[PDB]
Design an enzyme around this catalytic site. Structure first.
Site, PDB file in Angstrom:
ATOM      1  N   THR A  86      -5.229 -23.651 -50.507  1.00  0.00           N
ATOM      2  CA  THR A  86      -5.069 -22.272 -50.051  1.00  0.00           C
ATOM      3  C   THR A  86      -5.162 -21.342 -51.263  1.00  0.00           C
ATOM      4  O   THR A  86      -4.198 -21.177 -52.020  1.00  0.00           O
ATOM      5  CB  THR A  86      -3.699 -22.050 -49.358  1.00  0.00           C
ATOM      6  OG1 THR A  86      -3.607 -22.882 -48.196  1.00  0.00           O
ATOM      7  CG2 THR A  86      -3.546 -20.606 -48.929  1.00  0.00           C
ATOM      8  N   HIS A 251     -10.478  19.253   1.037  1.00  0.00           N
ATOM      9  CA  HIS A 251      -9.548  19.374   2.160  1.00  0.00           C
ATOM     10  C   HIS A 251      -8.116  19.696   1.770  1.00  0.00           C
ATOM     11  O   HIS A 251      -7.271  19.904   2.641  1.00  0.00           O
ATOM     12  CB  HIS A 251      -9.566  18.116   3.050  1.00  0.00           C
ATOM     13  CG  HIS A 251      -8.668  17.009   2.580  1.00  0.00           C
ATOM     14  ND1 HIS A 251      -9.121  15.950   1.822  1.00  0.00           N
ATOM     15  CD2 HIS A 251      -7.345  16.789   2.778  1.00  0.00           C
ATOM     16  CE1 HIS A 251      -8.121  15.125   1.576  1.00  0.00           C
ATOM     17  NE2 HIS A 251      -7.030  15.608   2.144  1.00  0.00           N
ATOM     18  N   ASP A 301     -16.210  16.007   0.327  1.00  0.00           N
ATOM     19  CA  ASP A 301     -14.825  16.431   0.182  1.00  0.00           C
ATOM     20  C   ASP A 301     -14.379  16.584  -1.281  1.00  0.00           C
ATOM     21  O   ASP A 301     -13.441  15.921  -1.737  1.00  0.00           O
ATOM     22  CB  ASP A 301     -13.913  15.444   0.916  1.00  0.00           C
ATOM     23  CG  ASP A 301     -12.489  15.950   1.057  1.00  0.00           C
ATOM     24  OD1 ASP A 301     -11.648  15.179   1.566  1.00  0.00           O
ATOM     25  OD2 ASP A 301     -12.207  17.108   0.672  1.00  0.00           O
ATOM     26  N   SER A 424      -4.409  11.833  -2.402  1.00  0.00           N
ATOM     27  CA  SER A 424      -5.674  12.479  -2.088  1.00  0.00           C
ATOM     28  C   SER A 424      -6.076  13.525  -3.117  1.00  0.00           C
ATOM     29  O   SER A 424      -5.258  14.332  -3.539  1.00  0.00           O
ATOM     30  CB  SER A 424      -5.592  13.110  -0.713  1.00  0.00           C
ATOM     31  OG  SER A 424      -6.161  12.255   0.252  1.00  0.00           O
TER      32      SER A 424
HETATM   33  C1  LIG Z   1      -5.604  12.110   1.423  1.00  0.00           C
HETATM   34  O1  LIG Z   1      -5.156  13.266   1.857  1.00  0.00           O
HETATM   35  C2  LIG Z   1      -5.393  10.896   2.301  1.00  0.00           C
HETATM   36  C3  LIG Z   1      -5.851   9.623   1.833  1.00  0.00           C
HETATM   37  C4  LIG Z   1      -5.693   8.432   2.610  1.00  0.00           C
HETATM   38  C5  LIG Z   1      -5.070   8.526   3.882  1.00  0.00           C
HETATM   39  N1  LIG Z   1      -4.875   7.392   4.691  1.00  0.00           N
HETATM   40  C6  LIG Z   1      -4.938   7.313   6.026  1.00  0.00           C
HETATM   41  N2  LIG Z   1      -5.215   8.338   6.818  1.00  0.00           N
HETATM   42  N3  LIG Z   1      -4.706   6.140   6.606  1.00  0.00           N
HETATM   43  C7  LIG Z   1      -4.605   9.804   4.340  1.00  0.00           C
HETATM   44  C8  LIG Z   1      -4.760  10.968   3.579  1.00  0.00           C
HETATM   45 MG   LIG Z   2      -1.972 -23.266 -46.557  1.00  0.00          MG
END
Ligand SMILES: *C(=O)c1ccc(NC(=N)N)cc1
Ligand SMILES: [Mg+2]
Ligand code: NA
Ligand code: NA
Ligand code: NA
Ligand code: NA
Ligand code: NA
Ligand code: NA
Length: 486
Positions: A86, A251, A301, A424
């Site tokens: 070493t 939305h 969206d 969302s």
């Molecule tokens: C967003 O506003 C959002 C995303 C996913 C869902 N899931 C369902 N509707 N099952 C609702 C809202």
């Molecule tokens: Mg060594």
């Protein structure tokens, strides 16, 4: 300019398993350095009785992180012979050779030595460091000591380490630590932040400060929480995409929402931010397909919120990378000739795509891993939309599930968690090259399974707007945000 010399003890006392472990540490270091957009030249040396040079800084390919990682990966413990000896002194002389000459004063040098400190051959290795400091004119004149140009890190390997010898060779700098036991992950994590300048990477998209002391705001720097006061109040997530813009779902707002009733929060700041205006995608229209049996149409969206005040990037407030921009090309470590189609082939391949989104759960932010069905499983994921509330009479389901959607959720290939209403507007992300690229915006879902529910149906699918499918709008609205769209 920066040079990093990886010196790995491959002697008898190290052992096969810990030698491999040592490489892992180095492989991960190279990867993290590259993720910060830093391109240093690498030196790669293993040693025992004598040194073996795998990579020299003078090689053109020494600054190619994939090539260097490849070399390191190919190194086998048994490759290095004469393990009975070493000679650390010699190992450092090999580094000295890479520095010596047959704008030098501008190159920074970082030596990373991995050994148990038990050299039994050659003289005292300290001598070589002294020669290196002399060679680089360090510690010779006040106002120009140039201590910043050299760092000697020593990572103690194994259970039987000689602390004194290891300490002796390491740099000695105030408020810094240059010695770490290889198993002490805290120490190793701190080393990185002493080596790389965070400032040079503040303008980089998809960056996350991953230190253990980091908060939720550090781990999801691009995250924006949006509040709409009305009637029932609204809550949506969004992503910072530029100093002035936050991308979210259309939305989340209505034409009846006034500017002052919409507040944005980022970086763990207690205050709320005021917005200038909301830019809905021009094709967005929730009532556009009622006649086709689609009560609420989520095509396009997406919406861009322009803040009143320009944001400044920091470890708690950073932009996420967007598809087909120069930022994502660099984040992926691809040449400047890369095209949108090529980024797409890389980010959204025809298959199940490993991705993730963020969901707040009682004050805390958590990451949910999911799979985008973009392979021969896509059609099935989409068709499950026929089971969504109010969609039972939609003639052609492909009329509601437009080409703008990405599909996740389900039990194949894995049990995907589902998005909740509060998520969302948030980003559906792809994690690549230790960077984060946004591929979609959380929009809607088929099955209401939110607390997240116990066990969910195999048809609980979630849909997100594919940013690749709204590029002309993003490119148009963000044309002055210096994002360099392709
Ligand atoms: C967003 O506003 C959002 C995303 C996913 C869902 N899931 C369902 N509707 N099952 C609702 C809202
Ligand atoms: Mg060594
Ligand atoms: Na390569
Ligand atoms: Na000095
Ligand atoms: Na900084
Ligand atoms: Na701070
Ligand atoms: Na580029
Ligand atoms: Na696509």
């Amino acid at each position: 300019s920066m040079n990093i010399y990886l010196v790995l003890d491959g002697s008898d006392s190290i052992g096969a398993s810990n030698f491999t472990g040592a490489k892992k540490v180095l492989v991960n270091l190279i990867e993290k350095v590259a993720s910060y957009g830093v391109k240093p030249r690498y030196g790669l040396v293993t040693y025992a009785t004598y040194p073996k040079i795998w990579v020299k800084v003078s090689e053109a390919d020494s600054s190619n992180a994939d090539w260097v990682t490849k070399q390191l990966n190919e190194i086998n413990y048994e490759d290095h012979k004469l393990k009975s000896g070493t000679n650390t002194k010699k190992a450092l002389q090999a580094v000295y050779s890479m520095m010596s000459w047959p704008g030098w004063n501008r190159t920074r040098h970082v030596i990373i030595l991995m050994t148990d400190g038990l050299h039994n051959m050659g003289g005292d290795p300290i001598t070589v460091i002294d020669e290196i400091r002399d060679l680089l004119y360090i510690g010779k004149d006040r106002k120009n000591p140039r201590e910043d140009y050299l760092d000697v890190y020593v990572f103690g390997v194994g259970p039987l380490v000689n602390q004194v010898n290891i300490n002796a060779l390491a740099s000695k700098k105030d408020n810094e630590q240059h010695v770490c036991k290889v198993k002490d992950m805290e120490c190793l994590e701190d080393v990185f932040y002493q080596m790389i300048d965070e400032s040079q990477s503040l303008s980089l998209c998809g960056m996350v400060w991953e230190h253990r002391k980091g908060t939720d705001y550090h781990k999801q720097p691009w995250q924006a929480k949006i509040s709409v006061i009305r009637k029932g109040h609204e809550s949506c997530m969004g992503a910072v995409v530029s100093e002035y813009f936050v991308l979210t779902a259309a939305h989340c707002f209505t034409v009846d929402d006034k500017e002052h009733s919409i507040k944005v929060s980022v970086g763990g700041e207690k205050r709320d931010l005021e917005i200038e205006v909301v830019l809905f995608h021009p094709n967005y229209n929730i009532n556009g397909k009622k006649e086709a049996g689609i009560p609420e149409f989520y095509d396009y969206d997406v919406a861009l919120i322009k803040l009143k005040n320009k944001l400044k990037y920091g470890q708690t407030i950073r932009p996420i990378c967007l598809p087909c921009t120069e930022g994502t090309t660099r984040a992926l470590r691809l040449p400047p000739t890369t095209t949108c189609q090529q980024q797409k082939e890389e980010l959204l391949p025809a298959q199940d795509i490993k991705a993730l989104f963020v969901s707040e759960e009682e004050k805390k932010l958590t990451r949910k891993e999911v799979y985008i069905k973009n392979g021969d499983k896509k059609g099935s994921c989409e068709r499950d939309a026929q089971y969504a509330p109010g969609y039972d009479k939609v003639k052609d389901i492909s009329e509601v599930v437009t080409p703008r959607f990405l599909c996740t959720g389900g039990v194949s290939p894995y049990a995907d968690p589902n998005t909740c209403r509060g998520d969302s507007g948030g980003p559906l992300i792809v994690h690549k090259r230790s960077r984060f690229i946004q591929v979609g915006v959380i929009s809607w879902g088929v099955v209401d399974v939110c607390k997240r529910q116990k066990q969910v149906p195999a048809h609980a699918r979630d849909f997100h707007i594919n940013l690749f499918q709204v590029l002309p709008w993003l490119k148009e609205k963000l044309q002055d945000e210096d994002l360099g769209f392709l």
